[PDB]
Design an enzyme around this catalytic site. Structure first.
Site, short mmCIF file in Angstrom:
data_model
loop_
_atom_site.label_atom_id
_atom_site.label_comp_id
_atom_site.label_asym_id
_atom_site.label_seq_id
_atom_site.Cartn_x
_atom_site.Cartn_y
_atom_site.Cartn_z
N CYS A 143 3.29 1.60 10.03
CA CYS A 143 3.31 0.45 8.57
C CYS A 143 4.46 0.49 8.33
O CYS A 143 6.05 0.70 7.77
CB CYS A 143 2.95 0.84 7.54
SG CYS A 143 0.54 1.45 7.53
N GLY A 152 2.35 5.80 10.02
CA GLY A 152 3.80 5.73 10.21
C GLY A 152 4.94 3.84 9.91
O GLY A 152 5.36 4.33 10.33
N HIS A 206 0.39 -1.46 -0.28
CA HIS A 206 0.37 -0.27 -0.09
C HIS A 206 0.94 1.44 0.18
O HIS A 206 0.09 2.98 0.09
CB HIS A 206 -1.12 0.05 1.43
CG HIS A 206 -0.75 0.14 2.53
ND1 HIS A 206 0.05 1.07 2.71
CD2 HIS A 206 -0.47 -0.96 3.46
CE1 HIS A 206 -0.04 1.28 4.03
NE2 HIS A 206 0.11 -0.07 4.02
#
Ligand SMILES: CN(C)C(=O)C[C@@]1(C(=O)Nc2cncc3ccccc23)CCOc2ccc(Cl)cc21
Ligand SMILES: CN(C)C(=O)C[C@@]1(C(=O)Nc2cncc3ccccc23)CCOc2ccc(Cl)cc21
Lengths: 306, 305
Positions: free
Chosen positions: A145, A143, A41
């Protein structure tokens, strides 16, 4: 003696954390050998988050669109491919700090350490369990991820989780390092909800054995139960059923403490019925379920404190 | 979202852990520059621990009696000296992985990460607080002595603890990196007991602010209290007194959540006089006191290392 929620030392994973930037999105990547793994993503552009076609978005990208930074050095991306929900960025430099590693897919009830990162920088390490509903109750801000879940067993890092998203209830969802989600989740902003969570019963029993090893005994009783009668009571408290495999895995702790599994099961049955009555077990007023039987054996001594 | 007991990333400390062996005793050492720090009780046998004269035991030792191993490499000890309850072994090689570091003595209530080690190998990392009775409620087995406590400020490691012993109740005692014990403990096998522990009030307040930041707000009430009336009630429940410095350090969390410190104190005052009533705060049925106000700000803002 003593019992703590203990994470594995995070150094071997810290030396793999890099920052991955695609357009305006910045998240974390895991640099192993000459490949940077990160959530796919990172390539999503605002209107491509409800129903992103990742195969199509990735085809439109070039290696020069991916900015990978390892400390204060920019890595050169020389290839990009997707494996399920993980993006693999081939780089022109092998990570000299690559530990001995493997990618392992874990099952619910399993525990692992999380190295929470922001902008490719490790900020904290904590221990958690894969819930029976396939979510993790992490501590993650925007942030985070690409932050990874791992276990270290005898010099080798087993990577088991990569953080992808936060669900509406504040619980977290992610994938193994092959990009396969844990649970019925998708890397889309579409309406998603975790199923009703339940207690990892085998882990509670392991933790009760840890308490006995550490000198706690107040919750013990003279009763035993059948496995079926225990499961009937346990499920009424949203505890997961205990299988024969769980009884077998609790065998070494049973042998070490002298309390048969079904004897401990009757103690758990009583604990659920009465509550703790102002008492604590290993400093906790609730039953802990994020310690597996393997964690308890790992952490505790060979001699039971009498 | 979420709130976890979070330790600092331990990598910078892992590259400093070595194994120190003296006779039959094997424990952990902290290799910084060309010096290996470890508990001085590594020079003790079994009788020695009962009534040890460390100055005399160390004088009888030579550099070659100390076996220091960093991974699968043996370090050459070229000097040895004692600073309080810590032994300093000068080695012929500076640790190439020495981070930016300082030795800091912490106060009760302060938190730090512990890197538990066995045979110079890191096995686990956990977060804990220096209790008001100067013990730490750690998780340590035999062989864990020399395991260290630390914090990280920017890219600098502050070493604040070195594990020395376990008390009869299962709680732990140790020193700063200058060898000074935290608490009224001595490094001898003798009758020792920790004083009655108390709750770190400023840390409970910080954790209540973390709960409000995470959406858990059932415990908030309309009331406020004076610092003096709060302390009178807190003392009664074996809670540490709250000082003006604690109120000031809780200021940013107060500003962020809109709950004045003394407003949060009246919430805590009620939680003490009445209990949780079957409810939980951040998934806990007990008030957590091992998160300082700085830990809560760091976690609920994402400061990196
Ligand atoms: C690693 N641990 C501690 C496990 O128990 C893993 C696990 C297990 O049963 N976990 C589960 C516990 N409890 C509830 C659960 C609900 C849904 C799904 C899984 C749940 C995962 C599934 O496959 C096995 C097989 C054999 C053994 Cl011994 C364990 C397991
Ligand atoms: C950055 N991008 C591109 C996102 O869309 C990430 C995002 C996400 O959950 N991020 C978050 C992770 N973890 C914690 C967080 C806390 C607060 C806020 C966000 C947090 C936000 C939007 O909803 C989805 C849906 C699906 C997927 Cl796979 C990701 C996401």
């Amino acid at each position: 003696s003593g019992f703590r929620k203990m994470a594995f030392p995070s150094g071997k994973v810290e030396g793999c954390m890099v920052q991955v930037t695609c357009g305006t999105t910045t998240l974390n990547g895991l640099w192993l050998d000459d490949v940077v793994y990160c959530p796919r993503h990172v390539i999503c552009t605002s209107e491509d988050m409800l129903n992103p076609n990742y195969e199509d978005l990735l085809i439109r990208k070039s290696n020069h669109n991916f900015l990978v930074q390892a400390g204060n050095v920019q890595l050169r991306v020389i290839g990009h491919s997707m494996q399920n929900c993980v993006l693999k960025l081939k780089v022109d430099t092998a990570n000299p700090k690559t530990p001995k590693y493997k990618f392992v897919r874990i099952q619910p009830g399993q525990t692992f350490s999380v190295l929470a990162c922001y902008n490719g920088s490790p900020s904290g390490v904590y221990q958690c369990a894969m819930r029976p509903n396939f979510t993790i109750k992490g501590s993650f801000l925007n942030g985070s991820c690409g932050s990874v879940g791992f276990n270290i067993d005898y010099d080798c890092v087993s990577f088991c989780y990569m953080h992808h998203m936060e669900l509406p209830t504040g619980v977290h969802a992610g994938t193994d390092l092959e990009g396969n989600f844990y649970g019925p989740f998708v890397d889309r902003q579409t309406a998603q909800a975790a199923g009703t969570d339940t207690t990892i019963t085998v882990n509670v029993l392991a933790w009760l054995y840890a308490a006995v090893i550490n000198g706690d005994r107040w919750f013990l009783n003279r009763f035993t139960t059948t496995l079926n009668d225990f499961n009937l009571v346990a499920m009424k408290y949203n505890y997961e059923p205990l299988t024969q495999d769980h009884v077998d895995i609790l065998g070494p702790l049973s042998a070490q403490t002298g309390i048969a599994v079904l004897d401990m099961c009757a103690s758990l049955k009583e604990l659920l019925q009465n509550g703790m009555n102002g008492r604590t077990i290993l400093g906790s007023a609730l039953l802990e379920d994020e310690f597996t039987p393997f964690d308890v054996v790992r952490q505790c001594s060979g001699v039971t404190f009498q």
